Write a protein that binds this DNA or RNA. Structure first.
Length: 270
DNA sequence: CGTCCAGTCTAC
DNA sequence: TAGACCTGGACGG
């Protein structure tokens, strides 16, 4: 997922787990190359926050829970197919690679990190990935300053469409978001990044890096809504103006990722 | 049946 | 910088 999907996933965990109590161990699928979670508690709560393309889970034992255990933080990157689902304990979806089990009483649920392609990762510790820039959703002012104070960086030599995927500067921006952002300002995707960013040192490119992904969050859904997978999927596809849309052009960037756009490809075009 | 298509991470 | 990492759906023969 991108920033909006990670943010909605964090809201799903907080909303869905608000009145739940978990017990026992954290179970990893045997095929996951991610680390075992050394955590056991008779009674713990799960909460979440998102920063860009990362999600932090906090496992917080209730007072008197046994065995003795301090809160534990886990940080997730979702890759191409990461998600969280709350399911019945004996109806685990395929590719549920990490599970947290509700304690009794009541219906036995499992909170699952589900990842079909297994591009997703998690680490022990609550640390955000070093070198990842500030969250375009939740840390806009820090994000904007971090870009404008580092335009000398060789990252800004590249086409703007490629610079927008660089997570040191645009933490949370992925492939659909770069197409939607550039389309709203009609900025050619193969314009030089430094030229577009020097020009802004009237909502501009850095502001849309915040307000555009925020619209996706405000839509809700993306697999985390009150509405079915069909209704959430229709609402998202109705919101897209550029990415995959008929009448739009598409090219491969230098890493073979497809950029969608209208009109002028821009000067650094392959 | 087959090919193509949908974000990091690492070896050159 | 190219290839690796992986599964499932759309689609073509």
């Amino acid at each position: 997922g991108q920033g909006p999907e990670l943010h909605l996933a964090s809201q799903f965990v907080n909303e869905a787990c608000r009145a739940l109590v978990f017990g026992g161990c954290v179970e990893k699928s045997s095929v996951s190359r991610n680390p075992e979670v050394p955590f056991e508690s008779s009674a713990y709560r799960i909460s979440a926050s998102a920063r860009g393309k990362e999600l932090r889970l906090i496992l917080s034992p209730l007072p008197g829970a046994q065995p003795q255990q301090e809160p534990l933080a886990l940080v997730f990157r979702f890759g191409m197919s990461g998600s969280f689902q709350l399911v019945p304990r004996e109806e685990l979806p395929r590719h549920a690679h990490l599970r947290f089990y509700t304690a009794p009483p009541g219906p036995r649920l499992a909170l699952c990190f589900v990842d079909i392609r297994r591009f997703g990762r998690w680490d022990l510790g609550g640390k955000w990935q070093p070198g990842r820039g500030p969250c375009v959703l939740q840390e806009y002012q820090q994000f904007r300053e971090n870009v404008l104070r580092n335009l000398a960086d060789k990252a800004f030599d590249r086409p703007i469409c490629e610079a927008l995927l660089d997570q040191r500067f645009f933490n949370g921006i992925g492939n659909y978001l770069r197409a939607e952002i550039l389309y709203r300002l009609k900025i050619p995707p193969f314009e030089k990044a430094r030229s577009v960013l020097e020009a802004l040192q009237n909502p501009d490119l850095l502001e849309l890096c915040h307000s555009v992904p925020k619209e996706v969050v405000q839509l809700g859904g993306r697999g985390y809504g009150s509405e079915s997978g069909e209704e959430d999927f229709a609402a998202f596809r109705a919101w897209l103006r550029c990415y995959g849309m008929p009448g739009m052009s598409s090219l491969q960037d230098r890493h073979g990722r497809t950029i969608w756009f209208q009109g002028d490809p821009g000067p650094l075009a392959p």
